[PDB]
Amino acid sequence: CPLMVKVLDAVRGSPAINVAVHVFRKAADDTWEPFASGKTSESGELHGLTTEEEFVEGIYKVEIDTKSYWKALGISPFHEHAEVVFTANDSGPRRYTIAALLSPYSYSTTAVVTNP
Template sequence: MIKVLDAVRGIPAAKLSIKVYKQKEDKSWELLSTRVTAEDGEVHDLVKEEDFVEGVYKLELGTKRFWSKVGISPFHEYVDVVFPANDAGHRHYTIAVLLTPYSFSTTALVSEPIETHT
């Protein structure tokens, strides 16, 4: 899951485009999915569980278009968050991003998946 907050207006960053890429062996990037944040600034299920295997991933946030929609001219065309995943077995990732037109900050919570019993 990813959660994005607009630090200028103090609200969730709704309708922000996010692309998910996986790095291939030749170091190029393969696009896995494109999503848009909901009104709460969140996107769940960015990648299908079976496709989220060990590797390096990149989240590309379409920040220029996001800020332009509210009349702000940003410094960044987009923001990339690049991270290794599942190198120690399958994990659940929650990534939080705090955005302004001229800066960004990220943090991650990496945890064991929660099994549900039906």
């Protein structure tokens, strides 16, 4: 709902399936406190991580375990993960799609942020 993570495999041209995603939120405090996690579906998407009420302002870290993904496909990738760190909901609730496009030695991440 307010947070969705979508992962693509740039080598296959496919969704990156079964990609583990961990979302953390920066506490008071400055530590990363576990916020949510999940795997991408066969569409490469991970929905349902959170809700409007739970997904409050914060600095969030979305950690995408790209390494396991590549390693399950036989590839020794460069990165340990793709992590995306951002301030969310700074000027009100938004919907965040966190897109990652994965290659063994490269990724990109894109945030699509929309306003209900």
